Design a protein around this ligand. Structure first.
Ligand SMILES: [Ca+2]
Ligand SMILES: [Ca+2]
Ligand code: NA
Ligand code: NA
Ligand SMILES: [Zn+2]
Ligand SMILES: [Zn+2]
Lengths: 294, 294
């Protein structure tokens, strides 16, 4: 059923596994994510950015998710606001029925980030909603002693510490590198669920599908599977994944468009796109250790 | 709000206009159709084929529509099962919350069509749901005296009489031709709302967009705008439209794929696709006379 974010992540935290947090912008993405969770018996975070919420309308975003939770009531699901930018945005998501919200004030100095985060936490906790915050900048790394105080004072439920990742398909020039020692220190000092942003891997098969369909991914590099596994070992419990989904999905859309110029049945485009997305999610659930955890 | 199909079509019947009945298979299509209706102050039929219902899940098809009706409560909307093939399918739709159902048994002989249609009508009317049936074969044309007896005996709410159209983008091998005298006789003998299937026009601008984006529409031909207007004059009150929507939508998808091979943001594909679909619907509402009828 639809539950507080912390209900899912506290379990992941205690048992040392990762739960994928999968972005959606419409029905096709949502359906594929839920079918993956059903097929792998995995809990999941379903998340929507502010842009996605604007696109769908927050009423439809929450509404569709509730319908899917009713279709699959045995799956623990948290509905999470990804990269909330203002107190007001977070409050709107709480009122609409989100069960987790991220307030991202990581671009502010420590004091201001702590202050805004704490304000969101008071409001969210009053409504029974879990809160994520962020420390460090994907484009300076997290300071573990800052993280310690930050969590203690804000009472935030989970923290996203910057350790080397970044959003999108172009995460690394040269060999991929993440600061796992910094990750481990943050984990020890905070003892709460941690969140990894920019965690798409861009798997070989997905890259190939996109390129075979005429796509261009020059210079793209994701987080290796091995690094994702090491992140979870290090204390990451929520793993934000968006780019892998988009690439897998759009690869199939491009392929259909290429192979039949007379094809305009939407389902012929989006059925294969859903399947590719679903498969990426299923594999990731197995990789992170959330499979068979329901 | 969401209302029985007859509420909308009895008004269209009395006042002599046509209401577009627009197929959807997902959120993007549904949203564009509703925005069109909002912007043209037009009632609308939103319809889903059995295939589309299988694709979405009937729970999501109805659920998304109810969310949209709550977002635009001033718009009269009927949710209609397009081409129901069995009593059981129609009954499932009634139980799920559809407010109109089509039972299509037009491939059977008169007696069997009447028998099945009558059975559906009894079940649907018990639940306050309006029913459409079909006479003739889109490919033999309706027999007006048959239609008269069929409507009387079945107590069906609206009838789709075969007068020369067919589904899809390839409607005519020669000059477009419809039997308007046959239409008028059916209208006169039945005095109920009538339905035009296969009513897409494939407008010049839509075709051009699709072609420009690398699509192939060799040989395609729809119902001319003038024929749609003549249909409405002749008594057509519900105008089924799907192909125009698909082509306009997919044209934009193809265009985005072509113009940027590195683009995989779903919203970059589907925002322009929604807009093109919305515009087709807005123009059609004006053409059929449902604009400014709320
Ligand atoms: Ca940030
Ligand atoms: Ca038929
Ligand atoms: Na997040
Ligand atoms: Na119909
Ligand atoms: Zn992020
Ligand atoms: Zn039809």
């Amino acid at each position: 059923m639809l539950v507080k974010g912390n209900e899912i992540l506290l379990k992941a935290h205690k048992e040392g596994y990762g739960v994928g947090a999968f972005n959606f912008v419409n029905f096709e993405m949502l359906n594929a994510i839920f079918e993956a969770g059903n097929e792998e018996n995995s809990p999941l975070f379903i998340q929507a950015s502010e842009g996605a919420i604007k696109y769908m309308g927050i009423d439809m975003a929450v509404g569709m998710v509730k319908i899917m939770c009713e279709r699959y009531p045995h799956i623990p699901v948290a509905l999470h606001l990804d990269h909330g930018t203002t107190f007001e945005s977070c409050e709107k998501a709480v009122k609409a029925g989100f069960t987790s919200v991220m307030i991202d004030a990581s671009h502010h100095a420590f004091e201001e980030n702590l202050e805004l985060t704490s304000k969101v936490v008071k409001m969210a906790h009053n409504a029974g909603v879990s809160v994520e915050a962020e420390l460090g900048r994907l484009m300076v790394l997290v300071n573990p002693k800052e993280a310690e105080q930050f969590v203690k004072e804000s009472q935030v439920d989970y923290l996203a510490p910057a350790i080397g990742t970044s959003h999108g398909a172009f995460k690394f020039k040269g060999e991929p590198k993440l600061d796992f020692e910094r990750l481990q220190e943050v984990k020890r000092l905070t003892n709460i669920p941690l969140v990894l942003h920019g965690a798409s891997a861009i798997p070989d098969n997905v890259r190939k599908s996109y390129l075979d369909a005429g796509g261009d991914l020059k210079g793209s590099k994701g987080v290796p599977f091995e690094f994702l596994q090491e992140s979870v070992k290090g204390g990451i419990n929520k793993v934000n994944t968006d780019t892998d989904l988009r690439i897998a999905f759009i690869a199939e859309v491009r392929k259909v468009a290429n192979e039949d110029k007379s094809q305009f049945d939407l389902r012929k485009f989006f059925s294969p796109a859903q399947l590719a997305l679903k498969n990426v999610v299923k594999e990731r659930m197995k990789l992170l250790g959330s499979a068979n955890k329901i």
